[PDB]
Design a protein around this ligand. Structure first.
Ligand code: Y33
Length: 243
């Protein structure tokens, strides 16, 4: 089609290895300059916040109303120097809040919950507040896309109210009837550094298009490029047209 061409021509602009995967419940579609990336496992980085919230709510280690208090030790960013709910930390990608959550879960529950749902290679090593940021946990774009697809459908192995709560922590914007949910990620502590823009689009007519951008990142890159590249693709596909 000409849709594909317009989509690929977008990537013909970008000088970084990238793949963009879509999943509608039937077919995987892959776009970008390095298609092989879709099958390659990278660290989830801050995309793991989705499964961290799920496991934590499912196992009574937090609620979506509980306030995670700033403990006075300044954080990497100044925007992180306050109190957060898990939903608020989800949009601000507040890492220390989600590290506290991982420490509340602990290594034994975290491991067995990840085996139970089959998330990536299901490997955490020895530091329970670090495995998604530096490894050994890794996951393919195809796996991320099918994961967030089931989330949107309520079909993950978690209580339906728990998926509903983490789902709405991901809500970004709606255009007329169509809803966009998304989570970004930048694993800087690894070589190569990996960028993520995972999420989905919920039509009003029930249908769901999950998506996963995965690209290589350089120190200094445009922190906004992951989201603006994904919205351009989704518009070129006709899944989430610009207004
Ligand atoms: C997660 O992947 C990553 C590490 C520290 O866990 C994290 C939280 C840092 C960044 S960069 C920074 C956080 N949010 C900012 C942003 O996107 N905007 C629009 C201001 C930049 C990210 C990231 O996803 O970019 N995640």
């Amino acid at each position: 089609s000409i849709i594909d061409q317009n989509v690929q021509a977008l990537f013909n602009e970008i000088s970084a290895d990238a793949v963009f995967v879509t999943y509608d419940g039937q077919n995987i579609k892959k776009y970008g300059t390095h298609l092989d990336r879709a099958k390659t496992a990278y660290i989830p980085a801050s995309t793991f916040k989705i499964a961290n919230a799920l496991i934590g709510l499912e196992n009574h280690k937090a609620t979506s109303t509980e306030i995670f208090k700033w403990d006075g030790k300044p954080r990497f960013f100044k925007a992180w120097d306050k109190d957060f709910t898990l939903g608020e930390a989800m949009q601000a990608s507040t890492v220390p809040v989600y590290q506290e959550l991982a420490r509340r879960i602990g290594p034994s529950l975290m491991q067995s919950e990840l085996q139970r749902i089959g998330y990536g290679n299901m490997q955490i090593g020895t530091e329970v507040d670090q495995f998604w940021l530096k490894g050994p946990l890794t996951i393919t774009p195809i796996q991320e896309v099918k994961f967030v697809y089931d989330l949107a459908q309520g079909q993950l192995p978690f209580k339906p109210e728990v998926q509903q709560q983490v789902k709405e922590m991901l809500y970004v914007e709606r255009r007329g009837e169509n809803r966009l949910y998304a989570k970004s990620g930048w694993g800087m502590a690894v070589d190569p550094q990996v960028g993520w823009y995972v999420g989905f689009v919920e039509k009003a007519d029930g249908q769901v298009v999950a998506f996963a951008l995965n690209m290589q990142m350089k120190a200094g890159d445009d922190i906004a490029l992951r989201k603006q590249l994904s919205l351009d693709v989704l518009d070129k596909l006709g899944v989430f047209h610009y207004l």
